[PDB]
Write a protein that binds this ligand. Sequence first.
Ligand code: 0N3
Length: 358
Amino acid sequence: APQQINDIVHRTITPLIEQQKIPGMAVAVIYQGKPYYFTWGYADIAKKQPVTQQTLFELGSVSKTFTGVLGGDAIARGEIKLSDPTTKYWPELTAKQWNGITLLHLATYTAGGLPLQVPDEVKSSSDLLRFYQNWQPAWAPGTQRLYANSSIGLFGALAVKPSGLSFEQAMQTRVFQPLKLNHTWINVPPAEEKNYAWGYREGKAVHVSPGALDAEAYGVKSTIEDMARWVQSNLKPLDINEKTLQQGIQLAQSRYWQTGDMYQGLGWEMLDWPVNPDSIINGSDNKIALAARPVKAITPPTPAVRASWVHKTGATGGFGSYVAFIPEKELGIVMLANKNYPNPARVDAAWQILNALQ
Ligand SMILES: *[B]([O])([O])[C][N]S(=O)(=O)[C]C1=[C][C]=[C]C(C([O])=O)=[C]1
């Protein structure tokens, strides 16, 4: 690999792994469109299995970017509109607070205070209907952003209804397959189990627990190679041959709302490049990222801006992921680790690497 990339990546990631006690990590840098890969440490500490370019990691909320793109593809297909009331796709949702809450609100966490988690107590489909029917918004729709699995998770489930496909079926056939993401999974198959890293939480090996709307909000697992290809696809959607998918990727990077210096896409979040690193670094801390913030509607949404830092953090109990890219520069990074370590450390390392390469 070019020595510049080798040095920049190793000088940043090595101390990060040491400081954060990360058991295993994979990184891809996309530079001028081509991927370069780096691996450290262990997928499975007990069985002494190293991290490789084929290791599967839990993406956590990086999964929201796939959900956003799949939703975008459904809009491009003419199956849904972001302006369509939620109740159009879930007629049983008759409670009055849902009047005026659209698919856009669900996709972008602006429905008016849907909670971060779906309660663990929600096990059945009737439990899910009950939860949404009884939910009381704190705010009018489209006025405040509150990051939430229960918001974009519902969006994903409703977005695929017109297709008649399950969420998993829709994701596989409309996103994973056309992009040749052949080691990316919502449910890790037995054939790929030997590659599935353990996550580590307080020293214990863990995998993500089953839960309501898990697939839609945080349930994707992938390898560093497939994630590099995901970044390439989002960097350059015009190279994608499937028209609705190309369009969906573009829609997911449109700017729908602004809060402070960040813009909300579908799954993706974006800031103007050049960024103030303190802004993205401090902004990624869950103390800010998960806060209720007033939003300004972008009316109409700005189409994907090439001079953007586009990114998403993801976590599960045992895993911590980060993806960031800058379309204008054909530059990006994926960092996948089997420990959920603090977001600002992820973003700081990412910015150090991309800034040195740009
Ligand atoms: B995203 O990364 O912001 C979502 N993160 S998460 O921690 O909410 C994902 C999640 C939800 C429920 C259970 C688990 C788990 O690891 O068992 C993870």
